Design goal:
By secondary structure, this protein is mainly alpha-helical. It contains ten helices and three strands; from the N terminus they run H-H-H-H-H-E-E-E-H-H-H-H-H. It has one domain. The longest helix is centred in the first third of the chain and has 25 residues. Bound molecules: ligand XO5 and ligand XNX. The site of ligand XO5 has 18 residues, from helix 4, strand 2 and helix 6. It is found in: Nucleus.
């Protein structure tokens, strides 16, 4: 069982491998393709074309990409050992709190620190590309957070274990089986620590974002998304109806 006490070196190393595999199979864009596309940057005309779009065109574009990013995180969560064995309540509690945070972490892979650009709809562009949204402060904070994560130079196994820990958090309010979540979290932390020690990457632990900075940024991001959704509702067919009901009712 993934929550079992006295987790062996076999269980811990398979947990590392299984989490990394779940991560790379739920990534919309492969890292090699994001790295290759770094030289493919939007021209002044294309940037002007994005700036001349209405607030509602840019909201619809952005909301569509975020809906897909979330759906991939739900698929990732469902591949995590023990997650599907939790009640629907506990699964919903972990995803409503953790899914956007995971999307925010995953964004660092599409961020280029050299020129401060992000991958958006085929090319790289700066934050000026999102001018029509009228969200420059929140967008600057998202760019700053991805900048800080990109300086860690995460390997696939590291970002995989880190995002799984963002999700399997026993402190999310509303959990019915809090003890079972503490056990799954304990084994993941053990796997994360074991992997960093084995690879001589423990230096990154003191460099990870402070406790609460990720929750705070996600809270501000979701609040803005909920305002746009109330003002100009996006019509989606929910892939996960019980989760969708909690976020949009
Ligand atoms: C595009 C992007 C940004 C930052 C970053 F680090 C990485 C990417 N690239 S990505 O991960 O491949 C794309 C995934 C969609 C994210 C859209 C998100 C962030 N972009 C600004 C618009 N935005 C909003 O939520 C606007 C809402 C508040 C009104 C900038
Ligand atoms: O398909 C499904 O069932 C589904 C279910 C939940 C969501 C979802 N949307 N969401 C937004 O912030 C959001 C809004 Cl408020 C408007 C537009 C775009 C987005 Cl991504 C979340 C935040 C945290 C956790 C979540 F699961 C979601 C998406 C899809």
């Amino acid at each position: 069982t993934p929550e079992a006490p006295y987790a062996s070196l076999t269980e811990i190393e398979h947990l590392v491998q299984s989490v990394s595999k779940s991560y790379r199979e739920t990534c919309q864009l492969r890292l090699e393709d994001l790295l290759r596309q770094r030289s493919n940057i939007f021209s002044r005309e294309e940037v002007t074309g994005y700036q001349r779009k209405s607030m509602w065109e840019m909201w619809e574009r952005c909301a569509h990409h975020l809906t897909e990013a979330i759906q991939y995180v739900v698929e990732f969560a469902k591949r995590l050992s023990g997650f599907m064995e939790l009640s629907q309540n506990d699964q919903i509690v972990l995803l409503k709190a953790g899914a956007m945070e995971v999307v925010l972490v995953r964004m660092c892979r599409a961020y280029n620190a050299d020129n401060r650009t992000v991958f958006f709809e085929g090319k790289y562009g700066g934050m000026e590309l999102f001018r029509a949204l009228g969200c420059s402060e929140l967008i600057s904070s998202i760019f700053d957070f991805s900048h800080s994560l990109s300086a860690l130079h995460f390997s696939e196994d590291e970002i995989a274990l880190y995002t799984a820990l963002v999700l399997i958090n026993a402190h999310r309010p509303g959990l019915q089986e809090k003890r079972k979540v503490e056990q799954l979290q304990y084994n993941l932390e053990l796997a994360f620590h074991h992997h960093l020690c084995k690879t001589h990457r423990q230096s990154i632990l003191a460099k990870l974002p402070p406790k609460g900075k990720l929750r705070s940024l996600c809270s501000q991001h979701v609040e803005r998304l909920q305002i746009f959704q109330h003002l100009h509702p996006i019509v989606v067919q929910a892939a996960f109806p019980p989760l969708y009901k909690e976020l949009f009712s």
